[PDB]
Amino acid sequence: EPVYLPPRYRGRIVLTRDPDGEERCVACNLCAVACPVGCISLQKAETKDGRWYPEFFRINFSRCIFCGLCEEACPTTAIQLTPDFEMGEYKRQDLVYEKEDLLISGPGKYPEYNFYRMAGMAIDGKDKGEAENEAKPIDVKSLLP
Amino acid sequence: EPAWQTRDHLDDPVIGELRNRFGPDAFTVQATRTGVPVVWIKREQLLEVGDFLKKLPKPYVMLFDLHGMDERLRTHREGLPAADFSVFYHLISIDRNRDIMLKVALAENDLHVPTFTKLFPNANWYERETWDLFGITFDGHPNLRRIMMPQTWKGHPLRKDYPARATEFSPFELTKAKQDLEMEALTFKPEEWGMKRGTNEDFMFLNLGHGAFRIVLQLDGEEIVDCVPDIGYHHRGAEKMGERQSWHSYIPYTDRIEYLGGCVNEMPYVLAVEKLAGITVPDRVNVIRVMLSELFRINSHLLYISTFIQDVGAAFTDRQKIYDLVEAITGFRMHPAWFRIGGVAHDLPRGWDRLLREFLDWMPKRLASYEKAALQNTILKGRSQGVAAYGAKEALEWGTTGAGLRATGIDFDVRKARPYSGYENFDFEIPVGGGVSDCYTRVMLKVEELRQSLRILEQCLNNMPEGPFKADHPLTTPPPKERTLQHIETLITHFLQVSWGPVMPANESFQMIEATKGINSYYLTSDGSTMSYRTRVRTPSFAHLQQIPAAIRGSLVSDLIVYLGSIDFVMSDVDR
Amino acid sequence: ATIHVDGKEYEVNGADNLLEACLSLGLDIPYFCWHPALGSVGACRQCAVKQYQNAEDTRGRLVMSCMTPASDGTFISIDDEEAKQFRESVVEWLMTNHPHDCPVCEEGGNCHLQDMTVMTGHSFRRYRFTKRTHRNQDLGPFISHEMNRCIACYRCVRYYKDYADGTDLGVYGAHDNVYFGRPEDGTLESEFSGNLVEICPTGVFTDKTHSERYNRKWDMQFAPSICQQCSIGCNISPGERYGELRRIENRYNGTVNHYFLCDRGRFGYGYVNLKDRPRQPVQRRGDDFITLNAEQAMQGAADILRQSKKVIGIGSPRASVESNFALRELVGEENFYTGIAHGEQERLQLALKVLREGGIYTPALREIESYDAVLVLGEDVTQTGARVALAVRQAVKGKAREMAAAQKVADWQIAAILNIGQRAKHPLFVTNVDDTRLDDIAAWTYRAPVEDQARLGFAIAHALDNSAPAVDGIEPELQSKIDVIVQALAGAKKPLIISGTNAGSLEVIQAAANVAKALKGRGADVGITMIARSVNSMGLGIMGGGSLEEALTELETGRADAVVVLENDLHRHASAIRVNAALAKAPLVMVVDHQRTAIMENAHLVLSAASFAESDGTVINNEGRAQRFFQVYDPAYYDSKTVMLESWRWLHSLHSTLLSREVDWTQLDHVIDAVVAKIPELAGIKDAAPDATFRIRGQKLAREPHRYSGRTAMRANISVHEPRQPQDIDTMFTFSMEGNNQPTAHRSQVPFAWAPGWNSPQAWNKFQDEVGGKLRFGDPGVRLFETSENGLDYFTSVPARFQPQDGKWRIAPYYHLFGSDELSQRAPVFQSRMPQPYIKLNPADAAKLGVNAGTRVSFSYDGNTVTLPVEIAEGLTAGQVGLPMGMSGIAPVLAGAHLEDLKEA
Amino acid sequence: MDYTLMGKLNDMVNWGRKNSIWPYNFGLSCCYVEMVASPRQADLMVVAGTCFTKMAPVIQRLYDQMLEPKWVISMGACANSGGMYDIYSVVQGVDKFIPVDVYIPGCPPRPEAYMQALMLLQESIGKERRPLSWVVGDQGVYRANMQSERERKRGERIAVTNLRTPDEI
Ligand code: SF4
Ligand code: SF4
Ligand code: SF4
Ligand code: SF4
Ligand code: SF4
Ligand code: SF4
Ligand code: FES
Ligand SMILES: [Ca+2]
């Protein structure tokens, strides 16, 4: 039989995508500093429209203690611990998981959160004033008092 | 007047007694958040003060803790005597239900203190650990050698100038240590262990093997004449790690000390940090923490009792059900890392009531099964009664807590004497024994504690309060996640708490709890920073392991094996 | 004065405000609009405390601590409940409109707004309405703009306009739509605009160069270093991550450059991350380039050096004192040559003789701000020594400060001071070949060739003191302006004379020395400042050596058949044809450098030296201050095959291999001891920083913060086994978090400022004895020489006036802050900011040549015909042609040279 | 496939070593009590716990007591790399001093992770080349350079889209 795991189970770590399909991670580095083992390493990169994303994202799973502090620290719900535990390996170097081994094609456990719908910083598809609870930018040369 | 307020405890009668005995200028009272009167004594008056406290009308009978502190990098020492190092002595009066911390200030060039072993014999191992990790000499100590590190170790790792992180691996030192293990028996000098009369031509010296540890046995035939348990094979640098992690990111390390306990080990650390932060948690947090701590207490007690039955010759499904419930709540079975500063990591999952109801409705028949298998078994009873028995005097003088102390008849449980996490809102009994603490009485007390923990779990299930699972404090770490993901100031607070760390104002906090094997305490010194200046963990298994030579003196090796099984201990708890 | 904060008695300065007095005492009061360097305005309303009328008062009143004098017998409370509630309310009001931006904001973890949000204990949003938004502007290649994150604290405009005198930044709009930016998109024109990224408490103005390769402040590995991009020697904190130089932060030094850098130093670090840098020793054999390790590089180099008859060494003003000294020991004192030209060396040793033998006190950069009259002779200070120009602007505002002090207005009340002193300012007289950026505040600007600038200086000295030599042929109008200058300088209590070597004229330095001596003879408190060219120009001058022409002559004559060139491209100091021919003649050329230069094609051996980020050393200030810089990172931590050693380490091991045939990778303190034993004038460099055995209670000084992340992952793609932490035998710093960076530690070298609750550049408050003052245990760096007891004599070599001769064109030097300095103009972000190559002409000379603005003219210098387009220069004088010094192909030795065959291409 | 240093019987020997594996479980720390013969008789060593410096010599000695062929499974973050204990008294990984054949992440891993370790080791022995006798043939071992388990399971792992939300049991 397959082993039942509850939805909260702290197993293999993945990076998720927002509902529009773009990757959720903005490379804010909060997960890496919140890691007590220090087994996350990433670098911020930026697209032409200004969107922050990770240039690389690597996790040393030979070091990781599956404590969930990174997922708790993630302000975009990009990094998530998933109910999977079959991560055994032949060589310890193969336990270093790059971004192509972590970025799944869906939203994971948090199905609808989009951090970029909250951020004031403008990207493609969201100019100034289009975030949540944001008024449109009043130009300083406006006639109104 | 909250429970975390800074108090000097000048209205404690022990302060007036010390003032009337030694004079008003002989000591300095420090105001702390430890909940304990802390007094600074001159080094030359330490033995006099200890002897005076030993002879009070309701005397201070137990040396709870003894350790050191490197005070050189401490920048907030206002109202404190000038010190480069210090040694603290935590002493407990049980008849008074009080405790006092004595502090001796030491200069860097003169790191010697009078030995406390003439007043409390558990000071032997406590002073050996202080010498090992701080380099503080204790004059008059019989065998002042290293107890955590090997004897060929350079430096004292708990000093502030000692690098915490692991040094480079050398194959040559590994072969050297293997060579030292090769003719360790051939070059065995029974003077380097505190033993005597080495080869009467009838004394045999052996090494032996809850964790793996060595004990050197002196045998006259089959009788034990002396023994020295060699510990430190499971030393993980947990306190030094407490200085290298933030207040938030240290919580998994609290888990891995006493790894059968989990959330039980989380509880004193987060309670002490909440004292430092000035956090009063809401009631739902208290009940959640009590429920998880009692589930893990049941798990640890079941493993201990099932191991004791198998060792004598007189278990998994119950622990699997507990692990399934804990896995549903926290996402992890063994090391949940789930308590937080100000609360718990998440709310209870929807469906926890069903799982806890299924666990509680399936357990009492197993309780009857264990009581029949243990209390009514004659082979277990004849194997386990009278072997390694001690009274109240031996449990008080050796710092024995938990089931052994209550088996001596001293009704001392932390959940009733000094309540924490809302344990005063539960109706449960504290089982005590007669005057004799042998293996059978300790195991019987653990079975009765299993029943009482099931009662506490029933009360946790019946009226679980509705409310927040995290406190409304600004220093609740992390903040609630939905407000973090929606609100900018909560995002700011979360950003700073999970990266640099939360800023605990400079103070000292203390919290002792009734753990699964005795009293576990966290003593935390904050220097105003986002990490601990000093994380001292008092564990029961250290003190219980020290009592072994004083209890099986004159017994057999099989009696020693039964005694080792009967002590609820694990080696990670001893060495931390 | 006696104040009582929360019932606790403190002794403070009564001339301070309560905010700076309480921050100096270690108390925490949140604040936004106040800055130690800008004064108090009372805008943000964050710093409220509760003041009581006396000890027997219980009601009190909320006052602003930055606007309240810390007078004697004051009673305040910070921990009052109503004051705490008000401060939390101010943070709440700033949070109502603040964008949800912290993860994608370059200020995160380094943000003062985050710190004061947490410090007030505000973590619950009860505002449910909309946030105002703003469009962003394009502010150029260095500064990124995000107006959403603004809290309208007005620090940016007050710095940029009232402090740095920039004109193109301001506040626009009204009530809650107040906008802070330029009037339109475009590059910020101030040379000191980069200080906005630390002045702004939020993420509005951020470092765009850092934003390209962003990382958070906890992930940075810092070291205390000295800026290498000119001679002013501002202290910097370079920080790295993943083996590349990420950021340059200002390192506080209350004696030099306290809060501010110039843009060249802040943004010109990009040459360190160039991918064409030498990373290994490389030997040229035929057409092959064999890569060597350190040991066999030393063995082969020592063999060829042993077989050669004479070896000469060519140092550089780029290199530290230790590297130049190690080259001097390898080749001998008689065979060591400074890498600068003969005229540059003459001007440099003349400025050194004036500084350490002229009997006139030379001020530190911070002390320049307290002088009462300034005469700048020949120096384009904004383009060559920019932080001195900023200090000169402060000295100019000194008159309004004195006027407001006369009306008993407190010195922190900046708005009242500026209102009292409307347009009044201390006298400033600048002199250049054209207009300068100091002309907006200059009382008078003299545009003339360098001979006429020197003659004006000599005439000022003669008018001040009749024993000074006279000048013949001064026009009556120029004479009237000379008397204006003389009446201003003689009436000042503290006159300051600034000159330097960049004018290309010895006579300008001589005239400045004459003016300073004449003022000293009248009893004035005169100071003199000399701006050198490079980071270690003064140290290379103090050590001394032959000129580059002598080294080239030794190579061309065949007397020297081996040349070791240290950190020198040789084309900025001599003609490229002659340098290339002389180096092709030598059968052994060994270049020790950290940048890919043109002479490495001719080099038989190339040693991959370390730059300032990967090396330790000592550099000498333009004021003679010896300052140690420390290595930021180990280059071999990420690339294991990189052999990038310090230049002194290379040359010391080469000397050891030459003598005893065994390598000796020495220690830095041994080299410094060798310097102070062999050169007694450089004996003060021992006290610049403590040696590598220095500890704070037994532990070393940490290079990176305690929350430094990714220890078991940053190298895991190379190997999953964590490497050994790189050992530092040279300095007292460790390459890890396992060290000390306490604000109360007894040290002078602070790699970065951090205190709990203070994650921003405002954490420098905790490291100072008083806020805006010195570092608590003294600023680092030691002055090499004291003021002489007796001065020099007057220089009687008064030059003749400039005469425009036909066919010849005198080259007037134009310096650019972005472009003239060699290493910074190699940085890729400087190319957009760099001016296009433009040759400057008078309108009369351009009309004589028949050339309009923009048409390309060709000229031959040293047999090399080059072509540049023409810019018309109104302020230049006829017969002079303006060239941008230090650019590609225009060596700085062209200043003062003549030009032939200038014609339209 | 690549290997790092008459055919049917070699496969029979590999099969006999594959379905007959006697483990020697090393206690060490919490990984053992999660996952629950003389070292001369055992041929697989399972190291499950922290390699403390005081008992790294014990681990190395009881590894040297085992006989050829011998395989090593390292359970948990401590035995893999040192885990969360990068501290003065801990050796950073089992593989610092003895060679490891299978690595199992977790703190602790599940018992089923140990069972998956047994399978991975079983095909690891199943397609390896070891000498038949001490006098006949090449006296060298040839371990197979297997495809990594994260490269093999990459497509199914990346194809995951939605997971159960964490508000339930
Ligand atoms: S689960 Fe814990 S140990 Fe693993 S990457 Fe996340 S923070 Fe680090
Ligand atoms: S915390 Fe989340 S968004 Fe930030 S760097 Fe990590 S995975 Fe990316
Ligand atoms: S300026 Fe500060 S508070 Fe605002 S988004 Fe950036 S880091 Fe957050
Ligand atoms: S842009 Fe920055 S410095 Fe200027 S008012 Fe806004 S927050 Fe202050
Ligand atoms: S003035 Fe000179 S030393 Fe100072 S930051 Fe600018 S280039 Fe660097
Ligand atoms: S990996 Fe985790 S569970 Fe296993 S021994 Fe180490 S701390 Fe214990
Ligand atoms: S700091 Fe005083 S009002 Fe802003
Ligand atoms: Ca170095």
What CATH number did the domain enclosing C812 receive? Answer: 2.40.40.20
Question: Hey, are the CB atoms on D103 and A90 less than 8 Å from each other?
Answer: yes
Residue D149 in 3-state DSSP?
A: helix
| Nearest CA owner, ligand 2 atom 6 | A31
Neighbours of ion ligand 8 (CB under 5 A): C 616, 631, 730
Long-range contacts from B118-123, C-beta under 8 angstroms, 24+ separation: B118/B47, B119/B47, B119/B50, B119/B51, B119/B54, B119/B63, B120/B50, B120/B62, B120/B63, B120/B397, B120/B399, B121/B397, B121/B398, B121/B550, B122/B63, B122/B66, B122/B397, B122/B398, B122/B399, B122/B543, B122/B546, B122/B547, B123/B63, B123/B66
Nearest atom in ligand 1 to the alpha carbon of residue D107 is: 3
Indicate the domain borders of chain A.
1-118
Cα–Cα distance, A87 to A13 (Å, whole number): 10
Indicate the domain borders of chain D.
3-159
Residue reference for tokens 């970029």:
A116
List the resolution, Å.
Answer: 2.7
Question: Hey, are the CB atoms on C131 and A60 less than 8 Å from each other?
Answer: no
Chain B contact for D108 (CB, 8 A cutoff): yes
Domains of chain B: 13-139 (3.30.460.80), 238-575 (1.10.645.10)
Closest to B537 in 3D by CA, of B557, B567, B515, B560: B515
Cα–Cα distance, B50 to B101 (Å, whole number): 11
With contacts defined as CB-CB under 8 Å, which chain B residues touch A66? 332
Write out the two tokens for A52. 């922050």
Cα–Cα distance, C265 to C386 (Å, whole number): 10
Residue numbers of the domain that contains C867:
808-904
Q: Which residue in chain C is spatially nearest to A55 when comparing CA positions? A: C213
With contacts defined as CB-CB under 8 Å, which chain D residues touch A2? none
Question: Hey, are the CB atoms on A118 and B327 less than 8 Å from each other?
Answer: no
The 8-class DSSP code of residue B359 comes to H
Write out the two tokens for B471. 């406190």
With contacts defined as CB-CB under 8 Å, which chain C residues touch D100? none
Report helix angle B488-499 to C112-119, nearest 10.
100
B179 contact partners, CB below 8 Å, separation of at least 6: none
Q: Decide if B387 contacts B555 (C-beta within 8 A).
A: yes
Ligand closest to Cα of C90 equals: 7
Residue A4 Cα, gap to closest chain C Cα (Å): 31
Q: Which of B165, B474, B531 sits opposite C738 (nearest CB)?
A: B165
What is the distance, to the nearest Å, from the Cα of residue C68 to the centroid of all Cα atoms in its chain? 35
Cα–Cα distance, B409 to A13 (Å, whole number): 51
Residue A105 Cα, gap to closest chain B Cα (Å): 22
H-state helical runs in B96-135: 123-134
Closest to C722 in 3D by CA, of B397, B167, D157: B167
Write out the two tokens for B236. 């993980």
Cα–Cα distance, C151 to C138 (Å, whole number): 20
Q: How crowded is residue C408: how many other Cβ atoms within 10 Å of its Cβ?
A: 6
H-state helical runs in C747-836: 822-825, 830-833
The 8-class DSSP code of residue B506 comes to S
Residue A73 Cα, gap to closest chain D Cα (Å): 16
Question: Hey, are the CB atoms on A134 and C211 less than 8 Å from each other?
Answer: no
Q: Which of D:74-113 have CB within 8 Å of C?
A: 81, 86, 92-93
What separation in Å is there between the alpha carbon of A121 and the centre of ligand 4?
17
Cα–Cα distance, C371 to C449 (Å, whole number): 27
How many residues can be counted in chain D?
169
What is the distance, to the nearest Å, from the Cα of residue B445 to the centroid of all Cα atoms in its chain? 20
Looking at 3.40.190.100, 3.40.50.12280, 3.40.50.150, 2.40.420.20, the CATH number of the domain D3-159 comes to: 3.40.50.12280
Rg of chain D over Cα atoms, rounded to whole angstroms, equals: 18
- Give residue ranges with CB within 6 A of ligand 3: B 492; C 98, 101-102, 105, 107-108, 111, 113-114, 149, 202-203
Q: How crowded is residue B4: how many other Cβ atoms within 10 Å of its Cβ?
A: 19
Q: Report the structure determination method.
A: cryo-EM
The 8-class DSSP code of residue A94 comes to G
Q: Decide if C61 contacts C74 (C-beta within 8 A).
A: no
The residue ranges of DSSP E strands in B107-222, in sequence order, are 112-114, 137-139, 203-206, 214-220
Chain D contact for C720 (CB, 8 A cutoff): yes
Question: Hey, are the CB atoms on C721 and D86 less than 8 Å from each other?
Answer: no
- Which chains would you list as touching B if contact means 3+ CB atom pairs under 8 Å? A, C, D
Q: Which CATH architecture has domain A1-118?
A: 2-Layer Sandwich (3.30)
| Residue A73 beta carbon below 6 angstroms from any ligand 2 atom | yes
Closest to D76 in 3D by CA, of D31, D40, D113: D31
Q: Which residue in chain C is spatially nearest to D94 when comparing CA positions? A: C721
Query: Degrees (nearest 5) of the Cα angle C503, C507, C512?
Result: 85
What separation in Å is there between the alpha carbon of A52 and the centre of ligand 3?
15
Q: Decide if B488 contacts C96 (C-beta within 8 A).
A: no
Residue B427 in 3-state DSSP?
A: coil
Q: Decide if C302 contacts C657 (C-beta within 8 A).
A: yes
Cα–Cα distance, B166 to B316 (Å, whole number): 37
What separation in Å is there between the alpha carbon of B247 and the centre of ligand 1?
16
With contacts defined as CB-CB under 8 Å, which chain C residues touch A58? 713, 716-717
How many residues can be counted in chain A?
145
State which of C34, C148, C151, C171 you would mutate to test the pocket of ligand 4, scoring each by most atoms of that ligand within 8 A of its C-beta.
C151
Q: Decide if D34 contacts D75 (C-beta within 8 A).
A: no
Q: Which helix (H) or strand (E) holds B255?
A: helix B251-256
- Sheet of C625-629, strand order: C617-620, C625-629, C782-783
Per-residue DSSP letters for C630-668? -----TTTT-TT---B-HHHHHHHHHHHHHHSS-----H
- Which chains would you list as touching C if contact means 3+ CB atom pairs under 8 Å? A, B, D
Q: Decide if C235 contacts C224 (C-beta within 8 A).
A: yes
Nearest atom in ligand 2 to the alpha carbon of residue A74 is: 1
Cα–Cα distance, C839 to C871 (Å, whole number): 6
Residue C553 in 3-state DSSP?
A: helix
Cα–Cα distance, C166 to C159 (Å, whole number): 9
The residue ranges of DSSP E strands in B234-392, in sequence order, are 339-340, 343-344
| Residue A14 beta carbon below 6 angstroms from any ligand 1 atom | no
| Residue C153 beta carbon below 6 angstroms from any ligand 4 atom | yes
Chain D contact for C738 (CB, 8 A cutoff): no
Phi-psi region of A133 (alpha: psi -120 to 50; beta: other; left: phi over 0): left
Cα–Cα distance, A50 to C146 (Å, whole number): 12
Closest to A62 in 3D by CA, of D149, C713, D59, B238: C713
The residue ranges of DSSP E strands in chain A, in sequence order, are 13-15, 40-46, 52-60, 79-81, 96-97
Q: Determine how β-strand D102-104 pairs with β-strand D71-75.
A: parallel
Q: Decide if C446 contacts C430 (C-beta within 8 A).
A: yes
